[PDB]
Design a protein around this ligand. Structure first.
Ligand SMILES: O=C(O)CNC(=O)NC1CCCCC1
Length: 167
C-alpha cells in the first residue's frame, strides 16, 4: 500500500490521473518524482519549469552545479538529484524533443530509466512542449516500465482521450 489517491489503474503497474504533477508531488512527497528534463537541465518551461519554480529555483541551482561537473545528459538518459520540497529524489529524464529532430525511438530508452526505481510519480515523457504524441508516449510507457508508475496528465481533455483510447 502507498499514498497515491484517485488514480485509474491501466495495467498491473501503470496508473494515471488528471493532476498537476507539482500539486501531486507537494501532497504525496513521493520517493521519486520524474522531471521532463532536457540535456542541459535548463528547467525553463513545461513540467521542468513548473517543478523548478515550486523549489524556488533550488532545482536549477543544483542542476547547474551537476552540469558544470558532468556535462550534459544524453537524450534517453537520466540523473538522480534532490527532490527538494517535492520528493525525496528527482529523476531527471530526457525524452526526445520532436521539435529538435531527436529520434522518437529514444523514448523507449528514456522510459527504461524508470525501471531503476520501484515507485515513481511521473509525467508522460516527450509530451507537452517536447512535441510527441502523448497516446504514443503512454503506449511506450506501458510496454517499457515494469516498476510502479503513477502518471500525472495536466490536460483533462488529453487525460480523457488517453483513458478512452487505451488498449
Ligand atoms: O497534459 C499533459 O500532461 C501533456 N500535454 C500534451 O501532451 N498535450 C498535447 C496533447 C495533444 C496535442 C498536442 C499537445
Amino acid at each position: 500500500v502507498n499514498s497515491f489517491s484517485g488514480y485509474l489503474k491501466l495495467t498491473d503497474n501503470v496508473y494515471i490521473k488528471n493532476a498537476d504533477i507539482v500539486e501531486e508531488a507537494k501532497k504525496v512527497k513521493p520517493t521519486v518524482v520524474v522531471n521532463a528534463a532536457n540535456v542541459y537541465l535548463k528547467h525553463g518551461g513545461g513540467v521542468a519549469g513548473a517543478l523548478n519554480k515550486a523549489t524556488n529555483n533550488a532545482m536549477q541551482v543544483e542542476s547547474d552545479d551537476y552540469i558544470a561537473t558532468n556535462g550534459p545528459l544524453k537524450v534517453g538518459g537520466s540523473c538522480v538529484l534532490s527532490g527538494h520540497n517535492l520528493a525525496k529524489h528527482c529523476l531527471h529524464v530526457v525524452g526526445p524533443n520532436v521539435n529538435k529532430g531527436e529520434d522518437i525511438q529514444l523514448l523507449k530508452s528514456a522510459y527504461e530509466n524508470f525501471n531503476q526505481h520501484e515507485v515513481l510519480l511521473a509525467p508522460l515523457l516527450s509530451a507537452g512542449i517536447f512535441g510527441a504524441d502523448p497516446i504514443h508516449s503512454l503506449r511506450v510507457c506501458v510496454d517499457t516500465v515494469r516498476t510502479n508508475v503513477y502518471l500525472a496528465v495536466f490536460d483533462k481533455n488529453l487525460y480523457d482521450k488517453l483513458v478512452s483510447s487505451f488498449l
